[PDB]
Amino acid sequence: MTLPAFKAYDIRGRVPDELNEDLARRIGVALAAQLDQGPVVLGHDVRLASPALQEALSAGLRASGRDVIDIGLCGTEEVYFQTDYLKAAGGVMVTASHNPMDYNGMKLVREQARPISSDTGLFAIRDTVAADTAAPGEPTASEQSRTDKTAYLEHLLSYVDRSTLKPLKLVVNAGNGGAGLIVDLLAPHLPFEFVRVFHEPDGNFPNGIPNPLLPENRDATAKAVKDNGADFGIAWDGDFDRCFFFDHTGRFIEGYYLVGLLAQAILAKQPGGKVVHDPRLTWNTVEQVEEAGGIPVLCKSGHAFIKEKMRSENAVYGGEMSAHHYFREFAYADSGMIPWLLIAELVSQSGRSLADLVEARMQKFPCSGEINFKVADAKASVARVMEHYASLSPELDYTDGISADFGQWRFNLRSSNTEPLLRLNVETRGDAALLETRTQEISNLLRG
Ligand SMILES: [Ca+2]
Q: Would the CA dihedral through 3, 52, 81, 60 be positive or negative? A: negative
By the 8 A CB rule, do 132 and 32 touch?
A: no
Q: How is domain 1-147 classified at the architecture level of CATH? A: 3-Layer(aba) Sandwich (3.40)
Q: Is the bond preceding 210 in cis, omega lying within 30 degrees of 0?
A: no
Residue 231's φ and ψ, nearest 5 degrees, are -65, -45
Amino acid at 302: G
Element (H, E) at 197: strand 193-197
Query: 324 alpha carbon to ligand 1 midpoint, in Å?
Result: 9
Query: 125 alpha carbon to ligand 1 midpoint, in Å?
Result: 22
Query: 388 alpha carbon to ligand 1 midpoint, in Å?
Result: 37
Reference 275, options 284, 264, 283; nearest CA is: 264
Interatomic CA distance for residues 318 and 277, integer angstroms: 6
Interatomic CA distance for residues 8 and 2, integer angstroms: 13
Amino acid at 183: V
Listed in sequence order, the residues at least 6 apart from 420 whose beta carbon sits closer than 8 Å to its beta carbon are 374, 375, 376, 377, 378
Mark 35-51 as b/e (b = at least 16 C-beta within 10 Å). Answer: beebbbbbbbbbbebbb
- Fill in the DSSP letter of residue 167: -
- Fill in the DSSP letter of residue 143: E
By the 8 A CB rule, do 253 and 281 touch?
A: no
By the 8 A CB rule, do 249 and 269 touch?
A: no
Query: CATH 3.40.120.10 spans which residues of the chain?
Result: 1-147, 169-246, 247-365
Residue 263's φ and ψ, nearest 5 degrees, are -60, -45
Listed in sequence order, the residues at least 6 apart from 127 whose beta carbon sits closer than 8 Å to its beta carbon are none
Q: Please identify which of the residues 58, 97, 335, 368 carries the catalytic annotation.
A: 97
Interatomic CA distance for residues 38 and 284, integer angstroms: 43
Interatomic CA distance for residues 317 and 45, integer angstroms: 26
DSSP 57-114: HHHHHHHTT--EEEEEE--HHHHHHHHHHTT-SEEEEE--TTS-TTEEEEEEE-GGG-
Q: Which strands form 274-277's sheet, in the order they lie side by side? A: 295-298, 274-277, 317-320, 324-327, 333-334
Q: Where are the alpha helices (DSSP H) in 283-372?
A: 283-291, 303-313, 338-350, 354-364
Interatomic CA distance for residues 194 and 172, integer angstroms: 7
By the 8 A CB rule, do 147 and 330 touch?
A: no
Query: 116 alpha carbon to ligand 1 midpoint, in Å?
Result: 16
Interatomic CA distance for residues 427 and 337, integer angstroms: 28
By the 8 A CB rule, do 426 and 379 touch?
A: no
By the 8 A CB rule, do 286 and 308 touch?
A: no
Q: Identify how the structure was determined.
A: X-ray
Query: 333 alpha carbon to ligand 1 midpoint, in Å?
Result: 13
Going from the C-alpha of 255 to that of each of 322, 323, 367, 408, the distances in angstroms are 6, 5, 11, 22
Query: 334 alpha carbon to ligand 1 midpoint, in Å?
Result: 10
Query: 20 alpha carbon to ligand 1 midpoint, in Å?
Result: 21
Helix (H, G, I), strand (E, B) or coil at 177: coil
Pick the CATH number of 366-448 from 3.30.310.50, 3.20.20.70, 3.40.50.2300, 3.40.50.1110: 3.30.310.50
Query: CATH 3.30.310.50 spans which residues of the chain?
Result: 366-448
By the 8 A CB rule, do 103 and 4 touch?
A: no
Interatomic CA distance for residues 119 and 276, integer angstroms: 22
Helix (H, G, I), strand (E, B) or coil at 348: helix
CA angle, residues 101, 45, 150, in degrees to nearest 5: 165
Q: Where are the alpha helices (DSSP H) in 195-302?
A: 215-228, 255-267, 283-291
Listed in sequence order, the residues at least 6 apart from 357 whose beta carbon sits closer than 8 Å to its beta carbon are 261, 346, 347, 350
Query: 335 alpha carbon to ligand 1 midpoint, in Å?
Result: 10
Interatomic CA distance for residues 363 and 423, integer angstroms: 23
Query: 238 alpha carbon to ligand 1 midpoint, in Å?
Result: 6
Strands 317-320 and 232-236, by their bridges, are unpaired
Interatomic CA distance for residues 125 and 10, integer angstroms: 11
Interatomic CA distance for residues 280 and 261, integer angstroms: 17
Listed in sequence order, the residues at least 6 apart from 256 whose beta carbon sits closer than 8 Å to its beta carbon are 281, 284, 285, 321, 365, 367, 427
The separation between CA 48 and the C-alpha centre of its own chain, rounded to angstroms, equals 22
Going from the C-alpha of 239 to that of each of 77, 94, 160, 195, 309, the distances in angstroms are 8, 9, 23, 20, 24
Catalytic site residue 97? yes
- CATH number for the region 247-365 comes to 3.40.120.10
CATH topology of domain 169-246: Alpha-D-Glucose-1,6-Bisphosphate; Chain A, domain 3 (3.40.120)
Helix (H, G, I), strand (E, B) or coil at 404: strand
